Design a protein around this ligand. Structure first.
Ligand SMILES: Cn1nc(-c2cnc(N)c(-n3cc(C(N)=O)cn3)n2)nc1C1(c2ccccc2)CC1
Length: 820
């Protein structure tokens, strides 16, 4: 009973629960007990919610940030359906009233007792919102398809909820005895030590004696800082290197434990391999104790000393700079700390950075202001999550201010908040409790929290923390654990299938590999594992019956799988596809697509719809992930191949794109396609310029039959090969309706580029704060400040709106001149 759950969690999280116990770590055991109770209490609160509130948990509303339409409606236990001519301005309730009235006339005799289910999807339409505010309806309006809904009664939803139940005295300087090492390298060994509070030094780094490569030291290392001046989040950072400089390894550790006790005495530090000091690095040792170089040290006893409780802490030209500052400016800000709190609360981040964290008096003064500091906007609170603000009280304050995040905003920044877990010092933290509580209150948040954590289980520095969080999540969600295992079983089968395809593609022809891929898929174990799951890309998308005949693979290096699905209940909306990719890291593609999706959110919040294609991309495992198939689309290169006997037969290369559009959009449909092409082109022109996406060719640009242009394969961003704006002749030709000269259409296009750009510029700090939190990911192209700088230049944030739009025209006209 409880035994099967534990063995289900182990298989699902990818780590045995026994491994947690084998550690004999009271920090681990205390996380597990406290979080289990927390997560079980979150599960209990859920079983007592109202049926609409339960819908808000399991099926949160997929909303969008007058005119009539046909809508098909049916009731749960019947095939009989009714089609109505409703208005987009109508609310679900009015639609539910019509359906109950038409059922009353047919069946010969209350709308608040029902909810509208999207046929063959894990999506519902409810709440006081007009129909055109729903994403599914909007998808059905832009394409032209008929929405299909099922009237679900309150008791049927309640049946779902039920079958888914579970001190200052120490004035002496800080010192450490550096005992000995046990490493490998070709020279002498120096052990550089240092004390840090986040990204900054609490004193100057102290080095060890040059001991030969053939190691013993037994050397006292004293730091220029008093033991009573040690901030609660003080970090001792070591670096072992070879010299005649060659780095060998690194290790960090917190001076206080999870129970606030200043650590004593002997410690063996299992070092991590080096690429010199790494304060941002994990404060947990290398779990590969058999091959890791170790540093044995001694924490001299000062006697049990604890960090003082909050009661003890609480007991103990300005405007022209507030928009990188000199020593005198820092002193000014500190003296005026009371003015900052009262008249500039949003400048807290700038005041936290000027405070002397190496002086216990200065810290307590700042902490007394923080304890009475007013709640900050989400935008400011996001800056406070950075490794640049390590203090636990500052971290707690950031969470307190982030509690007002809507489930939509939290979902948009979820990727960033999971990376911040990597900067954390202890297992039990406010961010974890926050993430878990929000995940257990929203099944879509929970789904993506799981997948962001599961995708990093093969990374030894996060495996313990991520495995512990996932376990606690499962305790508060036994039914979801089973749903996610079904996803893991399919992904496990797709891995084996892709391994076969890789082998078979080197030994025979594609029609032979495809047929045996099909033969492998038609096996019962594969038919069952690959069918009837929630999509890991989107839990509201149901991947029902696998369409073997339609399944294939791509010709690229890793031979990615093309898996098609169909759903009788969903009709046409159930015709969905997934791309299984194994061999490449999908983290950067995901980040890039999330950033484009954010841009689209921001343009839509300003009334601008640039017709973007925000398709799913999700890393699931070690160099493994999924991509959502965008159907009725092709690469520009494929359309430009000019294949014979087709409807897009072109005399000139320039005509191929427009000829393809004309064949997919005949008559009055053509003008609509050109508008879609132009809007989406402006969006991706701005997005790729702002994000610095280079290596753009006809093979990584796609078009939908609707005319919408989109980008694939984001292997390089932030100018990593200063990329210019890009305008292609083939595109300009389509924008200009197949005419050589058309200033009317081109100046409108230039306006879309101008507008899209200035909108992003106003939210330029949002992009900067999100990319700075993403530095914790370890993406080779987002590792330092020079990566962040690219965004600052492309957005021209250190300029005025009038001066930035001029600089954009300079770059736009350069791209138009390069266009043949
Ligand atoms: C018809 N079609 N549709 C797509 C498509 C649709 N939706 C996407 N999201 C997408 N993405 C590709 C990547 C990537 N990084 O490879 C990412 N997204 N590709 N690709 C094809 C082609 C093709 C399919 C299947 C077999 C051979 C060839 C190439 C004709």
């Amino acid at each position: 009973v409880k035994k099967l759950i534990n063995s289900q969690i182990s298989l699902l999280i990818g780590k045995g629960l026994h491994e947690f116990d084998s550690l004999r770590d009271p920090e681990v055991n205390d996380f597990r007990t406290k979080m289990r109770q927390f997560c079980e209490e979150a599960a209990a609160h859920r079983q007592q919610l109202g049926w609409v509130e339960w819908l808000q948990y399991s099926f949160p509303l997929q909303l969008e940030p007058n005119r009539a339409l046909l809508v098909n409606v049916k009731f749960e236990g019947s095939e009989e359906s009714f089609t109505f001519q409703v208005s987009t301005k109508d609310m679900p309730l009015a639609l539910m009233a019509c359906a109950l009235r038409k059922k009353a006339t047919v069946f010969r005799q209350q709308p608040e007792e029902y909810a509208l289910q999207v046929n063959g999807r894990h999506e519902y339409l409810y709440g006081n919102y007009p129909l055109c505010h729903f994403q599914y309806i909007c998808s059905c309006l832009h394409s032209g398809l008929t929405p299909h809904l099922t009237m679900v009664h309150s008791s049927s939803i309640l049946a779902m909820r039920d079958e888914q139940s579970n001190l200052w005295s120490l004035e002496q300087p800080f010192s450490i005895e550096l005992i000995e090492g046990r490493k490998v390298n070709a020279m002498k060994l120096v052990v550089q030590a240092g004390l840090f509070h986040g990204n900054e030094m609490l004193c100057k780094t102290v080095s060890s004696s040059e001991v030969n490569v053939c190691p013993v030291w037994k050397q006292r290392l004293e730091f220029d800082i008093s033991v009573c001046d040690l901030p609660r989040m003080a970090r001792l950072c070591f670096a072992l290197y070879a010299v005649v400089d060659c780095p060998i390894a690194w290790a960090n550790l917190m001076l206080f434990d999870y129970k606030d006790q200043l650590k004593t005495g002997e410690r063996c530090l299992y070092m991590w391999p080096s690429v010199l000091l790494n304060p941002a690095g994990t404060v947990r040792g290398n779990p590969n104790t058999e091959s890791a170089a170790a540093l044995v040290i001694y924490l001299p006893e000062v006697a049990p000393v604890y960090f003082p409780a909050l009661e003890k802490i609480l007991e103990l030209l300005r405007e022209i700079l507030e928009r990188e500052l000199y020593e005198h400016e820092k002193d000014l800000v500190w003296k005026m700390r009371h003015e900052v709190q009262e008249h500039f609360p949003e400048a807290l981040a700038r005041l936290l950075l000027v405070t002397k964290w190496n002086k216990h008096e200065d810290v307590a003064q700042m902490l007394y202001l923080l304890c009475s500091w007013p709640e900050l906007p989400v935008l400011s609170a996001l800056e406070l999550l950075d490794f640049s603000f390590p203090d636990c009280y500052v971290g707690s304050f950031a969470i307190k201010s982030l509690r007002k995040l809507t489930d939509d905003e939290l979902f948009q920044y979820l990727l960033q908040l999971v990376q911040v877990l990597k900067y954390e010092s202890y297992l039990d933290c406010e961010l974890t409790k926050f993430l878990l509580g929000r995940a257990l209150a929203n099944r879509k948040i929970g789904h993506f929290l799981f997948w962001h954590l599961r995708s990093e289980m093969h990374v030894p520095s996060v495996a313990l923390r991520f495995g512990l969080i996932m376990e606690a999540y499962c305790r508060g969600s036994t039914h979801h654990m089973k749903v996610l295992m079904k996803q893991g079983e399919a992904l496990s089968k797709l891995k084996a299938l892709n391994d076969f395809v890789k082998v078979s593609s080197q030994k025979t022809t594609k029609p032979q590999t495809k047929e045996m891929m099909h033969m492998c898929m038609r096996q019962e174990t594969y038919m069952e594992a690959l069918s009837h799951l929630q999509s890991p890309l989107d839990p509201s998308t149901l991947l029902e019956e696998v369409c073997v005949e339609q399944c294939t693979f791509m010709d690229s290096k890793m031979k990615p799988l093309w898996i098609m699905y169909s759903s009788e209940e969903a009709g046409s909306a159930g015709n969905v596809g997934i791309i299984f990719k194994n061999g490449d890291d999908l983290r950067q593609d995901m980040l890039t697509l999330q950033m484009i999706q954010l841009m689209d959110v921001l343009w839509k919040q300003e009334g601008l719809d640039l017709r973007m294609t925000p398709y799913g991309c999700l890393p699931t495992g070690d160099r493994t992930g999924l991509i959502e198939v965008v159907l009725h689309s092709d690469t520009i290169a494929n359309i430009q191949l000019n294949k014979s006997n087709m409807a897009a037969t072109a005399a000139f290369n320039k005509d191929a794109l427009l000829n393809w559009l004309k064949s997919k959009n005949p008559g009055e449909a053509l003008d609509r396609a050109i508008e879609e092409f132009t809007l989406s082109c402006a969006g991706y022109c701005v997005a790729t310029y702002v994000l610095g996406i280079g290596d753009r060719h006809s093979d990584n640009i796609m078009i939908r039959e609707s005319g919408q242009l989109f980008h694939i394969d984001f292997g390089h961003f932030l100018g990593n090969f200063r990329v210019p704006f890009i305008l292609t002749y083939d595109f300009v030709h389509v924008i200009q309706q197949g005419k050589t000269n058309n200033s009317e259409k081109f100046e409108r296009f230039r306006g879309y580029c101008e507008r899209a750009y200035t909108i992003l510029r106003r939210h330029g700090l949002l992009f900067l704060h999100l990319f700075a939190l993403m530095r914790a990911a370890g993406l080779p192209e987002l590792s330092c400040s020079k990566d962040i700088q690219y965004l600052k230049d492309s957005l021209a944030l250190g300029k005025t709106e009038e001066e930035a739009l001029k600089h954009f025209r300079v770059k736009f006209n350069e791209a138009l001149r390069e266009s043949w």
